[PDB]
Amino acid sequence: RLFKEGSDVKAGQQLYQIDPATYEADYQSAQANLASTQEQAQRYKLLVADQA
Amino acid sequence: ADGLAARGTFTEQLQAQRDLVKASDEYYQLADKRYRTGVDNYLTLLDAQRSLF
């Protein structure tokens, strides 16, 4: 718990932490797939100008 | 008689070869249409040119 109780908080201030541990794992999966699809898109962008 | 046999058969042979050349030209024009549209890359068109040649 990351707030002093009975105090004024701001909009967007972090209150708790709910142990990600699975939301980290699927984020690692999505970042791992993005790291290859972005590379293939960046290579095909260079090859499309030479009609290869 | 050998020359008469050659005169008899070379007309059909050259008609068949000229039809083969015309069909290869039509295949090259179709591959060029698929390249200009954007479905085929340039290596397929270069593969069709030497098949015409």
UniProtKB/Swiss-Prot annotation, chain B:
It is found in: Cell outer membrane. Disruption phenotype: Disruption of MexA, MexB and OprM significantly reduces active efflux of N-(3-oxododecanoyl) homoserine lactone/3-oxo-C12-HSL/PAI-1, but not N-butyryl homoserine lactone/C4-HSL/PAI-2. It comes from the Bacteria. Induction: By growth under severe iron limitation. Component of the MexAB-OprM multidrug efflux complex, composed of six MexA subunits forming a hexameric tube, binding to a MexB trimer, which interact with the trimeric OprM outer membrane channel protein. The OprM homotrimer forms a 135 Angstroms-long pore. It consists of a beta-barrel, which is probably inserted in the outer membrane, and an alpha-barrel formed by alpha-helices which probably spans the periplasm. In the ground state the periplasmic end is closed, while the outer membrane end opening is 6-8 Angstroms in diameter. The outer membrane component of the MexAB-OprM efflux system that confers multidrug resistance. Functions as the major efflux pump for n-hexane and p-xylene efflux. Has been shown in one study to be involved in the active efflux of the autoinducer N-(3-oxododecanoyl) homoserine lactone, thereby playing an indirect role in quorum-sensing; but has been shown in another study not to be involved in efflux of this autoinducer. Over-expression of the pump increases antibiotic and solvent efflux capacities. Belongs to the outer membrane factor (OMF) (TC 1.B.17) family. This is Outer membrane protein OprM. It comes from Pseudomonas aeruginosa (strain ATCC 15692 / DSM 22644 / CIP 104116 / JCM 14847 / LMG 12228 / 1C / PRS 101 / PAO1). The chain holds residues 387 to 439 of 485 of the full protein.
